[PDB]
Amino acid sequence: SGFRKMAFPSGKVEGCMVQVTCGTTTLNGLWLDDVVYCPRHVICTSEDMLNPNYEDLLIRKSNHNFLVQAGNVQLRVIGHSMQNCVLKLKVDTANPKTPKYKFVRIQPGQTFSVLACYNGSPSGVYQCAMRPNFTIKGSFLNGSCGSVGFNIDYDCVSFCYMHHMELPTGVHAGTDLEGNFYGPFVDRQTAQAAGTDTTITVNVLAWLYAAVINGDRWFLNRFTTTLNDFNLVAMKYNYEPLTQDHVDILGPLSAQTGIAVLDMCASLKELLQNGMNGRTILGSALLEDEFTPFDVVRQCSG
Amino acid sequence: SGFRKMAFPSGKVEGCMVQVTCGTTTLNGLWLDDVVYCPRHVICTSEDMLNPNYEDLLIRKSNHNFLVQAGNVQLRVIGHSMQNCVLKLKVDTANPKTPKYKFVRIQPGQTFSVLACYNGSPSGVYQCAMRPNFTIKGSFLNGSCGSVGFNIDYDCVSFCYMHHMELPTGVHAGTDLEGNFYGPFVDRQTAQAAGTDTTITVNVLAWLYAAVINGDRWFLNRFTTTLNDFNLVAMKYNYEPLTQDHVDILGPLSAQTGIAVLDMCASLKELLQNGMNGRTILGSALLEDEFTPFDVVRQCSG
Ligand SMILES: O=C(Cn1nnc2ccccc21)N(Cc1ccsc1)c1ccc(-c2cn[nH]c2)cc1
Numbered sequence A, B: 001s002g003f004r005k006m007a008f009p010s011g012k013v014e015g016c017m018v019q020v021t022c023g024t025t026t027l028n029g030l031w032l033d034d035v036v037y038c039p040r041h042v043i044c045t046s047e048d049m050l051n052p053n054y055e056d057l058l059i060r061k062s063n064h065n066f067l068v069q070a071g072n073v074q075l076r077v078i079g080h081s082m083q084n085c086v087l088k089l090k091v092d093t094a095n096p097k098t099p100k101y102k103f104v105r106i107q108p109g110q111t112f113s114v115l116a117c118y119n120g121s122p123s124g125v126y127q128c129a130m131r132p133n134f135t136i137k138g139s140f141l142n143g144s145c146g147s148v149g150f151n152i153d154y155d156c157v158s159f160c161y162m163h164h165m166e167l168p169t170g171v172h173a174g175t176d177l178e179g180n181f182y183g184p185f186v187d188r189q190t191a192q193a194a195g196t197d198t199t200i201t202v203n204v205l206a207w208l209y210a211a212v213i214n215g216d217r218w219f220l221n222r223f224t225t226t227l228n229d230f231n232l233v234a235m236k237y238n239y240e241p242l243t244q245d246h247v248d249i250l251g252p253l254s255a256q257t258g259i260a261v262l263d264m265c266a267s268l269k270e271l272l273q274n275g276m277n278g279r280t281i282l283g284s285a286l287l288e289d290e291f292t293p294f295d296v297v298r299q300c301s302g
């Protein structure tokens, strides 16, 4: 037993990280088959980033201006192209360490592992959720651009996130691996509104089930509620409205604990209206919304 | 910026995990050079674990009774021996993926990454601290025995922990890689007292510095304190006494933020005596003691 924020083992992704240098700037790239993916603002100077014309900036660059290093091995760039906000550098060698992989665009409320990297070298790994407002709350310093987020299904790495920017509020924004930003952000140094965030209700419920599985049961009570009544409470406390799709996803956890989803919603309602009264749940004095129902079942099944 | 509980990249350890089977039981082993390390209770049956005589149990076993599999590749066991609570299986092939490594015995209050494994296959990675009472609060299911904890220094993996047991309280106990348990525990199914735990004061202070570096400053106040006055408060709230050795370790964080350690102790004192008053620090409504001063500087330096 026990329940912790657990990242996927990062080995399959470590073998893909390279450093990408274009004149001045160095960041991280992702080497899969004979293509290296990295953020396109690698072609910018610091001044360029206020109103960069990426098309013109890229026209000034040839294959030989992109220096790509995988540890010590030097890659020979034989093609370059821009897709949305990513650069794709064709190299003449397929990465011998390429895992089975897919590119996926994840939904808000889903989680993934981030392998934070600097100069192409892995630094650490941690779990993140895509916030309802399409930001993530990560740990990224200067030089971390091009670090990627991923999930692993059996042997297949599904890459979902590439890191591009820190907003002045301190939260992080990035793209899928086709270079499309999550949310309304653009790769320009302007102030950008991250919209209203909300708490991921179905994840808080999955986490309450995780807590019951691991012995924390004090929040279980005598009450029940209805989808509509609960959604009134969710609205007041800025939680995502709960839907029948959410109820269905929580079915296995309902089945394994024998606690009906709506009875668990009644517990969450009480916690929202009265707080925790100084107690803790799975080591936290806040309601945790960064575990998906799948995250709970995976960690509670092995 | 941002600050998260960050594990080391697990790739160098993934290449070392094997499964070890001895008659009935299967668990994880660690393959380094031509030796595989695993918990000795792999030689037990379920009934054996109440009062196991490991010496006699091991005498019944020959090299060929230990089946060792590294993914699909079968290892040929050419020797076996017991060192304290670990088995060392000599195999005829050096692990080609052996990283540079050391075996270390860590001190309480130090942190490390755990690569949780089942049947020799990696499941996830997360940070743990060795509690003052030599337990760890992990996430381990049946079959996770032999999973290891480690730190990585540049290219060198320092292995510090091998997982052996879950206590009836739900916390976890294990050995160093010489097979010596941390704390008073033994590899028998008896009830065992984990002594009084305490909060790791120097880690809470390092985490408060991490918070200031990343914008959370509301707990900073007008007050100061002394080592002795603060230690009166630590005693009342079951915190480790603070020493000058701790003050010195916090020197770089003091220097980078310009907040004297004793002024930060004055903030911690106020938090302990009054609580947080519903506010949060780095996303937490509790005082966090699982980041060492080195963990803060590493994550805040790259
Ligand atoms: O946000 C960044 C880069 N970034 N990402 N995570 C960070 C954590 C700490 C500090 C900086 C961090 N920006 C701003 C921008 C606006 C639109 S996209 C990115 C950034 C700043 C400078 C460059 C640059 C490229 N060449 N020279 C400088 C790139 C991105």
Ligand SMILES: O=C(Cn1nnc2ccccc21)N(Cc1ccsc1)c1ccc(-c2cn[nH]c2)cc1
Pocket: A001, B025, B041, B042, B043, B044, B045, B046, B047, B049, B140, B141, B142, B143, B144, B145, B164, B165, B166, B167, B186, B187, B188, B189, B190
């Ligand atoms: O605690 C364990 C094994 N273990 N470790 N983490 C666990 C998380 C969930 C469930 C079990 C877990 N024990 C008890 C014991 C007491 C002294 S050392 C270990 C355990 C139980 C059974 C065996 C066994 C060996 N052969 N057959 C059964 C081994 C350890």
